[PDB]
Write a protein that binds this ligand. Structure first.
Ligand SMILES: C[N+](C)(C)CCOP(=O)([O-])OP(=O)(O)OC[C@H]1O[C@@H](n2ccc(N)nc2=O)[C@H](O)[C@@H]1O
Ligand SMILES: C[N+](C)(C)CCOP(=O)([O-])OP(=O)(O)OC[C@H]1O[C@@H](n2ccc(N)nc2=O)[C@H](O)[C@@H]1O
Lengths: 140, 140
């Protein structure tokens, strides 16, 4: 079976079980794959989404320890472009199907879905690190 | 080159970059290895070391997402025994060389070092999750 290149981009801040299960999902979209993972720059993340906890260096080094990750682009661009897919020869982009707004686009993954190049992944809730301190705030 | 079986046991609570680098170290002790990772039971950990944050189920599922881990024993025994090595055909046990007391033994890894069956790993400090909330406690 031919090898399919999947691109999962994210902030991947303070990596937790939900991200791990997503990367596993992406990696496992086709029998034979290369999972490329893009990590967002500290500047852009703080500019578009909000406060990041770990630096690009820290978020990128952890991804290096995860079984499903084949290559990392660090830092990665914010909006996937068609020129970006040809450059890294990506066949599919993987992320959750919840639309992801920009400021000029409502979805940012829209064109990938219309082109067939979007493989939706699912989220794991309640397993975040912030959620675990909330759990620790049950011994006091 | 023959395959060497390495056994790294730990609590592995709230897995962080130090544990990842240790497991990478153990896995990479010999060109060809099987890394077995033992995870300590919730009861025993709370009984010998102290309060654990995540449950055995939670600590074990994360280890499943780490590139260097080949097999998991969950739960694992507290003190490595000679019968335990023959059972899982472990050639070497990996952990930091800091002696690890019991209540009746001063080191617990002592006999493995005297027998040559101990491969020391190094720690990574300052990268723990508790350390990262301390870092977050710099925006208020
Ligand atoms: C536009 N980008 C790509 C530059 C940034 C978008 O990336 P993000 O904002 O989705 O960042 P993120 O790190 O929260 O998500 C990374 C990946 O983990 C998945 N994720 C996140 C949290 C969670 N509980 N479960 C998951 O499966 C998200 O669906 C996403 O596919
Ligand atoms: C006697 N046991 C084996 C049952 C429990 C001993 O295991 P532990 O108490 O060392 O638990 P732990 O989870 O803190 O350590 C797991 C592994 O990660 C390594 N570790 C831990 C913290 C850190 N900053 N750097 C590391 O390299 C430790 O040396 C150990 O080799």
């Amino acid at each position: 079976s031919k090898n399919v290149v999947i691109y999962a981009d994210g902030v991947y801040d303070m990596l937790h079980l939900g991200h791990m299960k997503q990367l596993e999902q992406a990696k496992k979209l086709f029998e034979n794959t290369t999972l490329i993972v893009g990590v967002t720059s500290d500047n852009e993340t703080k500019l578009f989404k909000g406060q990041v906890v770990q630096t690009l260096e820290e978020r990128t080094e952890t991804l290096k320890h995860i079984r499903w990750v084949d290559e990392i682009i660090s830092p990665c661009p914010w909006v996937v472009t068609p020129e970006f897919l040809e450059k890294y020869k990506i066949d599919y982009v993987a992320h959750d199907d919840i639309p992801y707004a920009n400021n000029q686009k409502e979805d940012i993954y829209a064109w990938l879905k219309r082109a067939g190049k979007f493989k939706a992944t699912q989220r794991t809730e309640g397993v975040s690190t912030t959620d675990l301190i909330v759990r620790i705030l049950k011994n006091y």
